[PDB]
Design a protein around this ligand. Structure first.
Ligand SMILES: [Cu+2]
Ligand SMILES: [Cu+2]
Ligand SMILES: [Cu+2]
Ligand SMILES: [Cu+2]
Ligand SMILES: [Cu+2]
Ligand SMILES: [Cu+2]
Ligand SMILES: [Cu+2]
Ligand SMILES: [Cu+2]
Ligand SMILES: [Cu+2]
Lengths: 271, 268, 268
């Protein structure tokens, strides 16, 4: 597959936060979505603009120790410093010993490994996390992708212990990337929608026995994803997603999946 | 593909509890088991007999925002109010985008979404929860179904952290619905028995790679279920089920799968 | 299968620990690895050398109530006593009614059920746990097996919260058995390697939709395992494994999978 390159910056934002961005002064929490096809190699031209050591570490993908982004493997970045990180991917295939080598495809994530502690406790806390999707040949591609990160008792490090709203139209193929970080377990729930507990979050067919769920227990550095048909069999509406741990939802760990009719309207709701 | 109609009532119960029932004065915790086939529509004539707003919200099934049972969608019920909730279910099928639409089938649950907080924290704590099973055409039906709800540090809101006992005979096909609620994670474990981590809790055949487990980590609003052949390869006995979080078992979060020999006896 | 017999000892160890061993004065935490093929029977002649009641209890495998290792089923062992526990396993196959019977194969574990509490809370905390592997005919066998137990905030009851290092050469087939015990949930993570969320931790082939993961939430009495090709697509190095709950990693719940080049060296 293709050899690609991107630039990534770790920036200190306002309210003491830390973000990854594709451009100087455009950092977000979560970080930009990185999307690769199995076989693709990505060279990340990383610059740490901060006054503290920072790194880039990735789950799931192939990398050498020289791209671990750890102190252990000397692959974190001094303040103002630069480093090229290399992420490789592979397709599934038959090994010489006759076994099936699992591909890179899945819902993954990248995060800092050296801000605050040697495990990135400070960096993760402040917002140095973002989503990676690795696709298999033939995977169904969505109309939109939305990333929801349960980071301690926050969603996407938003204030007032509350999460973002995502808009779609009835019938849209909407993809969710669901990442968890920090100290606590959570349960991710979405009203009016459900997905498969498997690689793609979609049943392959009637010979896929994967449990169909609307609620999933997640812990720190868990990642999964799924695609739904917005409003399928349920209609347009304000469709709550929330942590289902009762004190978490009560704290305001809640967001809206706003599913509009094709005339742009939505049944009346009271946020 | 039948249209069904039931009545459901929310009621205050003894010892500061609340429950759902099919008739006034007959509320239980957990609530009544609702069983549907994929394609069935259920109209629930729900009456809130209580002095606080209350709702019905279901996991997994198809419903419009007018049946959300939330403050957000104004679809909860005033004190002494009545409201018809509609739950729909669908069969799986091939979409016009060539993907496979997951059917409604599975182990699900319903609970209040407005007692105490706008997430039903009070209602759930006090007993407003019950199990829902949606069956696929050709699913294997059990000899009996038993519901185990880990609600905070209780089983089915019973006193003294203790779980109920369920009786079976060796060779019985026994279904468990396992639902978790409240604040805490748990691990559900059963002695002498095991199940598949998949939709039915039963391996479909040799092509089913699902992990076979006797221990499952669960969090609030998780629901799974399974069927076992009682005593299969292990024989009659008092087969403990317990949370496997050590302080949880130690405080009494334990019950018995009492599997009788064909003559009716349990060794011990 | 085959009928196998072993001796097992429960012994007190230095620092108030308790271990199982295959020989007196060779007890380890975790206990010895027990490996069976589906259909095998294992008779364990268990001697409790300690001054308190102790038991042997197994997850996943077939056993009668007389081998429960519980007070409930009067199958624990008096101080200094001996008891023969029997574990059976079965291959999968169709029942007479056409349903698929799952099979014993999996990553399992054995532990004490009577030290400290009637759920073995003290036995487990002190180190009375070990791994069981039940293999299916045609299962891929590894070059080595390493056991990692998250016991409360310890790995394998080691002091100062640290984990063991495990050594391999690039290309080795390395099996990990991952068991959790005690009070807390955890997330197991390995740098530079990944596995399938299914029975074997390896995809059956291109029809297996199991999620591929490098991070798994686990709770008390959870067992899973997997095999990796050491350094596959990533090369030689010090490959960290760690609990991913940030306070757990920060307090030292970390270890190294040391993958050497064929020439015996590792990158700095
Ligand atoms: Cu790490
Ligand atoms: Cu939460
Ligand atoms: Cu990580
Ligand atoms: Cu809700
Ligand atoms: Cu529990
Ligand atoms: Cu809910
Ligand atoms: Cu037990
Ligand atoms: Cu941990
Ligand atoms: Cu146990």
């Amino acid at each position: 597959g293709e050899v690609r390159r991107i630039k990534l910056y770790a920036e200190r934002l306002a309210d003491g936060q830390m973000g990854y961005g594709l451009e100087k002064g455009r950092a977000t929490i979560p970080g930009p979505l990185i999307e690769l096809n199995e076989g693709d190699t990505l060279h990340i031209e990383f610059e740490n603009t901060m006054d503290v050591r920072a790194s880039l570490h990735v789950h799931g993908l192939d990398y050498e120790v020289s791209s671990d982004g750890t102190t252990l493997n000397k692959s974190d970045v001094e303040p103002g410093g630069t480093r090229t990180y290399t992420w490789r991917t592979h397709a599934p295939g038959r090994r010489s010993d006759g076994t099936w080598r699992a591909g890179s495809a899945g819902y993954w994530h990248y995060h800092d490994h050296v801000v605050g502690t040697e495990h990135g406790t400070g960096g993760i806390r402040k917002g140095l996390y973002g989503p990676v999707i690795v696709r298999r040949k033939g995977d169904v591609l969505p109309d939109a992708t939305h990333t929801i990160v349960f980071n301690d008792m926050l969603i996407n490090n938003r204030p007032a212990h509350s999460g973002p709203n995502f808009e779609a139209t009835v019938g849209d193929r909407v993809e969710f990337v669901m990442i968890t970080h920090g100290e606590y377990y959570h349960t991710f729930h979405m009203h009016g929608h459900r997905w498969a507990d498997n690689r793609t979050g979609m049943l392959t067919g009637p010979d896929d026995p994967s449990q169909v769920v609307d609620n999933k227990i997640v812990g720190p550095a868990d990642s999964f994803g799924f695609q739904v048909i917005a409003g399928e069999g349920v209609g347009a509406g304000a469709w709550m997603y929330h942590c289902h741990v009762q004190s978490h939802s009560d704290m305001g760990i809640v967001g809206l999946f706003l599913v509009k009719k094709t005339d742009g309207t939505i049944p009346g709701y009271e946020p």
